[PDB]
Design a protein around this ligand. Structure first.
Ligand SMILES: COCCN1CCN(c2nc(SCCc3ccc(OC)c(OC)c3)c(C#N)c3c2COC(C)(C)C3)CC1
Ligand SMILES: COCCN1CCN(c2nc(SCCc3ccc(OC)c(OC)c3)c(C#N)c3c2COC(C)(C)C3)CC1
Lengths: 41, 150, 200, 160, 50, 160, 41
């Protein structure tokens, strides 16, 4: 009889949740014109 | 009980049904089966019905004949042949756990293990066979013609 | 034939002859499985056979060949259809697999009638588009609204092994170990030797 | 970015569509997003744990879609309380430094957030845990007198 | 080959398999099945899927 | 083009529908849809590196439904950084000369988009590389000993 | 064993990523009426 025991103690296990989600900018500022007219240039 | 009844049908039955003289193994009661116990106070939480629980399992748990890189016919100038593994039949309780249901901008992508308590279990529970009050499977052997019971 | 076939590289070319019943070989050639019971899959069954290809060759005195009738574990090209990524991209899963499993392998569709006769209809990709791992990302697949999505947006595609011919016997996975009885000798002890090399 | 309008096209005073979208990329948000029962449970893990320190403003890293992780972690900015009715969102927001613009705002990247952990109860190597019977893993444990006597455990989260 | 394999199939196989004495005729080619070859740079043109 | 209004339909101060679409075709944009992780992995190979560029940004050719290239070619004007949400894909914009009006806005014409000359390309032919173990490519190079060595590699982009 | 063997000559490699452009006009400029009224002629 001979076993390689590993004896349990409290071991720090900071590893936590993995998940998804879309990245977005900081700053996704559009440009809307506050002035009506032809885009001249 | 059902832990036994799968162990019998995965190991014993296919080895007993070709022991000589046996021309019939009946098995009791049935194998395992990934029983998806839905939880209707979790399905209403996600605005789902058991339609969309079944629809995703017939989608994401579906074995798909993908095919072959370098399949037939090739292009003139080919040197590579493989055989693409698509989505396999999903092989575990945890791999049904991450069966997806919708787009998830809650994303810990909407788990089937968030709405349905996944576990294995038998295919019907109409039979409880407690041998001496202790749970049991069984198998009823029927001897073939060539009836050599010894 | 076979001597000049040693000159042909890139292929284990050999030849043989047909008996009345063609499953034996060199006049005594036995045949043998090695079944899996304990649900070990196939690679641990293969590691058993890789150990008993060697152990067949460690007794050339009685097990005079290890002829393979299966196939070695070829590469086969995995695709991780990234499910999480795929539906949240917009595209439903049931449209992916009926693309990927009906562009590459080629689905049956229905019949058609050529010359008053029923002939099948097989949708499949053109050959130059289902041909490389690079041609994963050419399969544009519709999202929920109607904007096209490439496969390379969501199909992380690695390689892996796979035996491209899996045999089964007694309803369980198993591989066709062959062997001739020792040259001129009997297979009665060679079949006995396998049952005591079955302890390895 | 683009020019969704071009020269000649009439634009209107505060119009619906947009001309072009100026974006700033070097701090980049990732809308890390959480299920509802989890950030109840992780907020009821404040009474049991948690523990977050110091600077309880957690690190978030990616597994971006080439498989390789993003080279540096980033700051978990906040936690919403904006539970999406059809999914269950506790939508977080991880701001990341983006030096070489290897983030490209708009893809999906798997963002794992590193919640603090003082209650660090058990670990055990994988050989000592018999998986089957699935549901109830059994670790073979010594008794008091070298006569071993197994216990069922809760083998949930295989850390490596 | 396939230009031939139907000519075996549409003419010969149904004539040899009832030639006298003949049991199972195993054809070694195919019937001349309509092979839709899709073209994914034409699908992305028209925004379709298979 | 057309006249979406006719000679008498009431139009309003900035209505929704256009009257008629004028159209300038003499240069032409080609909005070119790179995937996300590919535009990631090409910039990733510009920091591995080398990879290279052509020193003048850039060159893109077309190959329409014939299988022969366009009578000329032109410039990748810019590269978007907004990944589109529902395609997961960068929109490059390739600007092409068209003194012939043989381009047509919307084709959707395949853009062969040339990038910079991988300068040390260890091109083993595909006939020799097999995967030992699972997912690990092994060329079987014989040394100067005339003895083979099964050195593992990493098998990148299968080119042809 | 007669084993044909390839010695790797490496350097030049034009990599071109062929990928689906969706062409658009250089100025679309939809003529929208600046000013209400019946389109007279
Ligand atoms: C669904 O069952 C239909 C088959 N019937 C004919 C055979 N009969 C019988 N079954 C058994 S053992 C049944 C094994 C078993 C295990 C788990 C079960 O739960 C899933 C279960 O329930 C069915 C049975 C025996 C005995 N000994 C006998 C009969 C019948 O009489 C004998 C004297 C032969 C002893 C069982 C009933
Ligand atoms: C239906 O296919 C399975 C039949 N198997 C047993 C018989 N075997 C055999 N096939 C053939 S002919 C193969 C014809 C063919 C044509 C087109 C194909 O493309 C579709 C094709 O692929 C299947 C085969 C012959 C001869 N002579 C022999 C055997 C076998 O040994 C002989 C000496 C009798 C000569 C072929 C394989």
């Amino acid at each position: 009889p001979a076993v390689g025991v590993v004896t349990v103690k409290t071991e720090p296990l900071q590893i936590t949740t993995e998940l998804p989600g879309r990245t977005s900018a900081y700053r996704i500022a559009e440009v809307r014109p506050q002035v009506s007219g032809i885009i001249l240039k | 009980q059902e832990d036994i009844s799968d162990y019998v049908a995965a190991n014993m039955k296919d080895a007993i049904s070709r022991t000589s003289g046996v021309g019939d193994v009946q098995l009791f009661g049935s194998q395992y089966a990934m029983r998806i116990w839905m939880n209707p106070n979790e399905l209403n939480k996600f605005q789902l019905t058991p339609v969309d629980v079944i629809t995703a399992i017939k989608a994401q748990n579906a074995q798909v004949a993908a095919g072959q890189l370098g399949g037939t016919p090739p292009v003139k100038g080919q040197q590579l042949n493989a055989s693409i593994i698509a989505q396999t039949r999903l092989t575990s309780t945890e791999e049904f756990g991450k069966i997806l249901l919708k787009v998830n901008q809650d994303g810990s992508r909407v788990l089937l293990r968030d709405v349905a308590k996944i576990e294995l279990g038998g295919e019907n529970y109409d039979i409880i066979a407690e041998f001496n009050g202790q749970p049991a499977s069984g198998l009823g052997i029927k001897l073939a013609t060539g009836a050599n019971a010894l | 034939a076979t001597r000049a076939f040693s000159q042909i590289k890139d292929a284990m070319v050999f030849a043989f002859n047909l008996p009345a019943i063609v499953e034996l070989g060199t006049a005594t050639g036995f045949d043998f499985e090695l079944i899996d019971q304990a649900g070990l899959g196939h690679e641990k069954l293969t590691q058993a056979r890789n150990q008993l290809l060697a152990e067949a060759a460690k007794h050339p005195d009685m097990l005079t060949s290890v002829r393979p009738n299966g196939l070695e574990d070829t590469p086969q090209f995995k695709i991780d259809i990234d499910q999480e990524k795929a539906q949240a991209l917009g595209v439903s899963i049931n449209d992916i697999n009926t693309t990927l499993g009906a562009a590459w392998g080629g689905s049956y569709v229905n019949d058609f009638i050529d010359r008053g006769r029923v002939k099948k209809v097989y949708v499949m990709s053109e050959a130059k588009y289902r041909m490389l791992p690079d041609d994963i990302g050419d399969w544009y697949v519709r999202a929920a609204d109607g904007q096209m999505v490439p496969f390379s947006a969501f199909s992380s595609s690695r390689w892996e092994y796979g035996s491209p011919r899996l045999e089964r016997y007694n309803g369980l996975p198993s591989m066709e170990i062959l062997g001739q009885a020792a040259p001129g000798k009997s297979t009665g002890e060679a079949m006995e030797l396998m049952e005591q090399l079955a302890s390895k | 970015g683009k020019s969704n309008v071009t020269e000649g096209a009439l634009v209107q005073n505060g119009q619906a569509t947009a001309l072009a979208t100026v974006q700033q990329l070097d701090p980049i948000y990732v809308d890390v997003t959480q299920s509802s029962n989890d950030m109840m449970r992780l907020k009821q893990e404040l009474a049991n744990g948690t523990l977050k320190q110091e600077n309880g403003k957690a690190k978030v890293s990616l597994i971006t879609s080439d498989g390789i992780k993003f080279p540096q972690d980033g700051t978990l900015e906040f936690s919403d309380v904006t539970v999406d009715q059809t999914t269950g969102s506790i939508t977080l927001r991880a701001i990341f430094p983006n030096p070489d613009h290897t983030m490209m705002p708009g893809m999906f990247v798997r963002a794992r957030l590193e919640e603090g952990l003082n209650p660090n109860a058990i670990l055990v190597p994988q050989q000592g845990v018999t998986r089957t019977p699935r549901g109830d893993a059994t670790v073979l444990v010594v008794g008091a007198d070298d006569k071993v006597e197994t216990r069922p455990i809760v083998a949930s989260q295989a850390i490596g």
